[PDB]
Write a protein that binds this ligand. Structure first.
Ligand code: HEM
Length: 182
């Protein structure tokens, strides 16, 4: 995954738990020979998994919980790190932003060539609900989507409820989320 993801995890932990805790995690992740993450450079996915795994152990929180927090953090973090305009061009409401999600990831995809973005499809079921279909080349990142959706809720002063209804882990084709919103 691109450096920006690892920078954000790093930033999230440093800001909440301090520089020492970050170093402890860094060490345990097996990444002490890396002084900084380069935001526009592609890293092996392993870097991210090892980071999250290491932080799970050092912080005493399950990985899935950290992925949720990371998901929430990302919406705010990107607006401050080069993507404020891009975010604003994706919409004025949550359902609109969700429709534009592939588009948004493609507009990053011009900048970042070796991107492997997820694919999202919205089936609207009412003016206050939708089904969100999530397909990915990667495993175990559905909890991250849950945090992203709450981030977006916060962004749009919109109350939101997200419940996963289908899991790859039980053998379903792809993850599906039921979403209700203000
Ligand atoms: C400007 C805002 C956003 C930017 C700049 C952005 C950019 C990125 C980038 C660079 C990656 C890594 C892809 C790779 O390295 O292959 C990624 C991954 C991902 N994105 Fe976003 N993204 C944004 C918003 C969102 C939102 C709102 C969602 C809501 C569901 C989302 C869902 C995901 C998921 C689930 C992944 C994990 C990769 C995977 O599933 O394969 N992104 N994003």
């Amino acid at each position: 995954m691109y450096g920006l993801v690892n920078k954000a995890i790093q930033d999230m932990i440093s800001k909440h738990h301090g520089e020492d805790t970050w170093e402890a995690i860094k060490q345990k992740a097996g990444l002490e020979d890396i002084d900084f993450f380069v935001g526009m450079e592609a890293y092996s996915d392993d870097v991210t998994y090892h980071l999250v795994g290491a932080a799970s152990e050092v912080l005493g929180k399950p990985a899935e919980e950290l992925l949720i927090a990371f998901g929430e953090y990302w919406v705010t973090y990107t607006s401050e790190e080069g993507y404020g305009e891009l975010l604003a061009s994706a919409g004025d409401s949550l359902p609109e932003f969700m429709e534009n999600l592939d588009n948004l990831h493609a507009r990053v995809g011009l900048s970042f060539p070796q991107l492997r973005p997820p694919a999202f499809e919205c089936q609207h079921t009412s003016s206050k609900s939708m089904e969100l279909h999530y397909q990915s080349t990667r495993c175990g990142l559905a909890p991250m989507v849950l945090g992203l959706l709450h981030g977006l809720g916060k962004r749009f002063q919109t109350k939101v409820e997200v419940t996963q209804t289908a899991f790859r882990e039980t053998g379903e084709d792809h993850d599906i989320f039921s979403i209700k919103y203000e």
